[PDB]
């Protein structure tokens, strides 16, 4: 228990940062806001990266910042599509990060 | 030796159309993407545009966007910034930085490598 | 977003030790890079990822993170490094931001 306590201590809360700010790209519809929270997701990611596993986060901050690059063209719709494929990217480091762990 | 030039800056009428050219050597700009920076005499360095000649991509200043448009072009090795409608506040030197691809070490190296910088006054 | 670079001068003399904090807005990792622009020039790089050295520059210079908080540490002021030196964030390419600039100065 006291193993398991220590990784949430170190990561837990960089993933609920990701994952907190992926349902706010989702319900936001306009390119003010899915800027600022793919600019809030990609401080989380680096700052996780600094805790093979850090080229899995090499993959996510280069998606982030494709989706990034078309939300700041203004196509908000296009963005959240590209957001999608960014969860299941985001979930899969976290069934690799718990297996470790 | 990696080395950025520019070029164009003088004196230009309120209004008026002016073109900074940042002719790159030592390098391909295919791999690193350009900026361009500009200080204001006697003022702090402020931020201005950049263009990802690999990606295509393009991105202003929120206090400058729909007047610049800056392209590169590969086969001539530089980087423009075609200004229009220059107002009174757009006097400063223009520095032309540089800037790695993400992943790796280029990317963390931010700005290692500057230009001169050109003067631009806006004069009536 | 925001970068405040404080103090915006200081004085120092020759051997002293020079402390320059820099805190973000809000959370940039460690993208956070320190430059010297001497009066008349373009500015050189000094620190990058907020804690690394660029190679070339004298081995003085020191970088540090606490959680948003930044600085930048000088050893001995040599009288070479009498000049202004500006807090930039670099989170993504459209999103660069610079310090208002902390300028040091010869005591008497």
């Known amino acids: 228990h006291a193993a398991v306590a220590a990784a949430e201590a170190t990561i837990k809360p960089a993933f609920e940062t990701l994952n907190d700010n992926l349902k706010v790209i989702e319900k936001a519809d306009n390119a003010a806001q899915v800027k600022d929270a793919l600019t809030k997701m990609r401080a989380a990611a680096l700052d996780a990266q600094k805790a093979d596993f850090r080229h899995g986060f090499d993959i996510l901050v280069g998606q982030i910042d494709d989706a990034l690059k078309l939300a700041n063209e203004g196509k908000v719709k296009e963005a959240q599509a590209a957001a999608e494929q960014l969860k299941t990217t985001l979930a899969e480091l976290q069934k690799r990060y718990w297996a470790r762990t | 030796e990696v080395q950025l030039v520019e070029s164009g800056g003088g004196l230009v009428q309120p209004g008026g159309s002016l073109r900074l050219s940042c002719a790159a050597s030592g390098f391909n700009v295919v791999d690193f993407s350009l900026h361009w920076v500009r200080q204001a005499p006697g003022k702090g360095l402020e931020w201005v545009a950049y263009?990802?000649?690999?990606?295509?991509?393009?991105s202003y200043a929120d206090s400058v966007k729909g007047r610049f448009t800056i392209s590169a072009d590969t086969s001539k090795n530089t980087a423009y910034l075609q200004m229009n409608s220059l107002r009174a506040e757009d006097t400063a030197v223009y520095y032309c930085?540089?800037?790695?691809?993400?992943?790796?070490?280029?990317?963390?190296?931010?700005?290692?490598?500057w230009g001169q910088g050109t003067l631009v006054t806006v004069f009536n | 977003i925001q970068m405040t670079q404080s103090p915006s001068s200081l004085s120092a003399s020759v051997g002293d030790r020079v402390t320059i904090t820099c805190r973000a807005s809000q959370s940039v990792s460690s993208a956070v890079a320190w430059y010297q622009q001497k009066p008349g020039k373009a500015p050189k790089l000094l620190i990058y990822?907020?804690?690394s050295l660029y190679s070339g520059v004298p081995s003085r210079f020191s970088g540090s993170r606490s959680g948003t908080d930044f600085t930048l540490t000088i050893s001995s002021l040599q009288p070479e490094d009498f000049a202004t030196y500006y807090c930039?964030?670099?989170?993504?390419?459209?999103?660069?931001?610079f310090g208002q600039g902390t300028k040091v100065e010869i005591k008497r």
């Open positions: 263009i990802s000649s690999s990606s295509g991509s393009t």
């Open positions: 930085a540089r800037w790695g691809y993400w992943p790796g070490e280029p990317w963390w190296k931010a700005f290692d490598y």
């Open positions: 930039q964030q670099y989170l993504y390419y459209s999103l660069v931001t």
């Open positions: 990822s907020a804690s």
